[PDB]
Design a protein around this motif. Structure first.
Motif, PDB file in Angstrom:
ATOM      1  N   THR A 229       8.341  -1.583  -6.144  1.00 20.54           N
ATOM      2  CA  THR A 229       7.096  -1.790  -6.263  1.00 20.54           C
ATOM      3  C   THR A 229       6.717  -2.896  -5.255  1.00 20.54           C
ATOM      4  O   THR A 229       6.394  -3.820  -5.222  1.00 20.54           O
ATOM      5  N   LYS A 230       6.064  -2.661  -4.402  1.00 23.93           N
ATOM      6  CA  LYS A 230       5.064  -2.961  -2.835  1.00 23.93           C
ATOM      7  C   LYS A 230       3.813  -2.719  -3.261  1.00 23.93           C
ATOM      8  O   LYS A 230       2.833  -2.219  -3.814  1.00 23.93           O
ATOM      9  N   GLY A 231       2.991  -3.626  -2.565  1.00 30.28           N
ATOM     10  CA  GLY A 231       1.504  -3.498  -2.392  1.00 30.28           C
ATOM     11  C   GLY A 231       1.548  -3.140  -1.093  1.00 30.28           C
ATOM     12  O   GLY A 231       1.806  -3.502  -0.160  1.00 30.28           O
ATOM     13  N   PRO A 232      -0.116  -2.619  -0.614  1.00 31.92           N
ATOM     14  CA  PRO A 232      -0.329  -1.924   0.066  1.00 31.92           C
ATOM     15  C   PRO A 232      -1.053  -3.127   1.532  1.00 31.92           C
ATOM     16  O   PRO A 232      -1.855  -4.004   1.037  1.00 31.92           O
ATOM     17  N   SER A 233      -0.562  -2.424   2.616  1.00 30.54           N
ATOM     18  CA  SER A 233      -1.698  -3.128   3.730  1.00 30.54           C
ATOM     19  C   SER A 233      -2.819  -2.732   3.712  1.00 30.54           C
ATOM     20  O   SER A 233      -3.086  -1.187   4.049  1.00 30.54           O
ATOM     21  N   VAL A 234      -3.638  -2.797   4.099  1.00 30.87           N
ATOM     22  CA  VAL A 234      -5.327  -2.374   4.939  1.00 30.87           C
ATOM     23  C   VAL A 234      -5.556  -2.557   5.995  1.00 30.87           C
ATOM     24  O   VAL A 234      -5.230  -3.845   6.288  1.00 30.87           O
ATOM     25  N   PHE A 235      -6.505  -1.875   6.771  1.00 28.37           N
ATOM     26  CA  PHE A 235      -6.203  -1.489   7.540  1.00 28.37           C
ATOM     27  C   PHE A 235      -8.038  -1.023   7.633  1.00 28.37           C
ATOM     28  O   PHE A 235      -8.474  -0.171   7.655  1.00 28.37           O
ATOM     29  N   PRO A 236      -8.660  -1.889   7.938  1.00 32.55           N
ATOM     30  CA  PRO A 236     -10.457  -1.266   8.195  1.00 32.55           C
ATOM     31  C   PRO A 236     -10.513  -0.322   9.732  1.00 32.55           C
ATOM     32  O   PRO A 236      -9.823  -0.483  10.454  1.00 32.55           O
ATOM     33  N   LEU A 237     -10.848   0.603   9.383  1.00 35.69           N
ATOM     34  CA  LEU A 237     -11.325   2.108   9.975  1.00 35.69           C
ATOM     35  C   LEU A 237     -12.663   2.093  10.532  1.00 35.69           C
ATOM     36  O   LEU A 237     -13.923   1.878   9.647  1.00 35.69           O
ATOM     37  N   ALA A 238     -12.935   1.891  11.694  1.00 30.56           N
ATOM     38  CA  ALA A 238     -14.380   1.349  12.677  1.00 30.56           C
ATOM     39  C   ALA A 238     -15.121   2.804  12.255  1.00 30.56           C
ATOM     40  O   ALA A 238     -14.796   4.213  12.904  1.00 30.56           O
TER      41      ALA A 238
END
Lengths: 210, 222
Positions: free
Chosen positions: B123-132
């Motif tokens: 059970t892991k939380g997600p990493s978020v990267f903004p997409l320009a």
């Protein structure tokens, strides 16, 4: 044993769809049919060759001939789009064999073209020591699409993951395709592009680093 | 109406066991016996076995023979389903269904199904990267922006833009299951590019099983 159905069937409204289900000599065996609309559970539609359960439309009728039993959905409607499975009780292994399933596609919607937006890796994704490409497809019909990626203009087959199509708020399909990369390949190749073929029609998007 | 309600979705790790209940409503439970059915993703129906509510004897299919346990409870009018030595290829929706003694031979009433995702990931939380969006687009038209929800292994992650005020143009795509047993999806909004600096675009990537509440803005490329 080994009940066999054709995978796909397409019938426009008004016509009658005759989904066939073939086992070795179904000689008046206990043929049963089930509709399984997406997301929900199978519901009994025709039992005992040709009989119906109460509350099932009069349209549905079954027929179990000699070596092949079929399901006759007279006057097909748009709300009949689903997967249909057949089933008998095999006494040889005392099992309950199900058919292969048949996706019945009611037509009545003209062919639609995808919109295949592309996203480079993030400036913050590269700060996290990774680089993933994004391919997003939406607003296209015939629920079948083939995906192929191109780095620069040289072929690729590594690090690409693609999901299966899905119905939208619209009744047009949608799917997503991803590509994980290494950052040195990302700025070495001049541009990345999405090549998405639907019914034999390819649309592309292009971007260059920063 | 005689209903079949099943247990909710379960998330197991390979080599474990999983019990799935399927409650009958109303009549004397031990009237007409019921069976169980597996259905792996995208694939078709597979019969698993039978239990008789009365005579609690069982009868399984050969594939799941010995690794499936079926029990029933007369008091609460239910049937149970246990897979032993859980394997990754058992990820499926497990239906239950009753056949009525008499009319006829098919399963007239079916259950809702119980999704049983089976994988070794944690059970892991997600990493978020903004997409320009499109770099130029100064005098262009409409462009697309989005957030990348990368790497997590429970599949109810919920994304919403600006606390729900943003609705037009939103298309959150179904998640992909990468080969490592881990998930990733994207959520993208289409908007006229004339507003590439006068309204704010922030996505809220919530992931309840790790209680990871992360906000991430998507500004024009720079």
């Amino acid at each position: 044993y080994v009940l066999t159905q054709p995978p796909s069937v397409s019938v426009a409204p008004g016509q009658t769809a005759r989904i066939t289900c073939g086992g070795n000599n179904i000689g008046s065996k206990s043929v049963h049919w089930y509709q399984q609309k997406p997301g929900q559970a199978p519901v009994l539609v025709v039992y005992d060759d040709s009989d119906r359960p109460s509350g099932i439309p009069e349209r549905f009728s079954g027929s179990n001939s000699g070596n092949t039993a079929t399901l006759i959905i007279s006057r097909v409607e748009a709300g009949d789009e689903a997967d249909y499975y057949c089933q008998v009780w095999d006494s040889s292994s005392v099992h309950y064999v199900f058919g292969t399933g048949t996706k019945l596609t009611v037509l009545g919607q003209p062919k639609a073209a995808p919109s295949v937006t592309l996203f480079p890796p993030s400036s913050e994704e590269l700060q996290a020591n990774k680089a993933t490409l994004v391919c997003l497809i939406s607003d296209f019909y015939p629920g079948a699409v083939t995906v192929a990626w191109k780095a620069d203009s040289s072929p690729v087959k590594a690090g690409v993951e693609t999901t299966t199509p899905s119905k939208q708020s619209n009744n047009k399909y949608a799917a997503s395709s991803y590509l994980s990369l290494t950052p040195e390949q990302w700025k070495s190749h001049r541009s990345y592009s999405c090549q998405v073929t639907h019914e034999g029609s390819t649309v592309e998007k292009t971007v260059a680093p920063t | 109406e005689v209903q079949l309600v099943q247990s909710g979705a379960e998330v197991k790790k390979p080599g474990s066991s999983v019990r799935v209940s399927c409650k009958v409503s109303g009549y004397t439970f031990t009237g007409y016996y019921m069976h169980w059915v597996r259905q792996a993703p995208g694939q078709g129906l597979e019969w698993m076995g039978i239990i008789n509510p009365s005579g609690g004897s069982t009868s399984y299919a050969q594939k799941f023979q010995g690794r499936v346990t079926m029990t029933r409870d007369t008091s609460t009018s239910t049937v149970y389903m246990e897979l032993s030595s859980l394997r990754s290829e058992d990820t499926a929706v497990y239906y239950c269904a009753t056949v009525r003694v008499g009319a006829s031979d098919a399963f007239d009433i079916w259950g809702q199904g119980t999704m049983v995702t089976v994988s070794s990931a944690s059970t892991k939380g997600p990493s978020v990267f903004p997409l320009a969006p499109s770099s130029k687009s100064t005098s262009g038209g409409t462009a697309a922006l989005g957030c990348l929800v990368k790497d997590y292994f429970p599949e109810p992650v919920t994304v919403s833009w600006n606390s729900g005020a943003l609705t037009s143009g939103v298309h959150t795509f179904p998640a992909v299951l990468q080969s490592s047993g881990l998930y990733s999806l994207s959520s993208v909004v289409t908007v006229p590019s004339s507003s590439l600096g006068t309204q704010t675009y922030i996505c809220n990537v919530n992931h309840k099983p790790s209680n990871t509440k992360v906000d991430k803005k998507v500004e024009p490329k720079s």
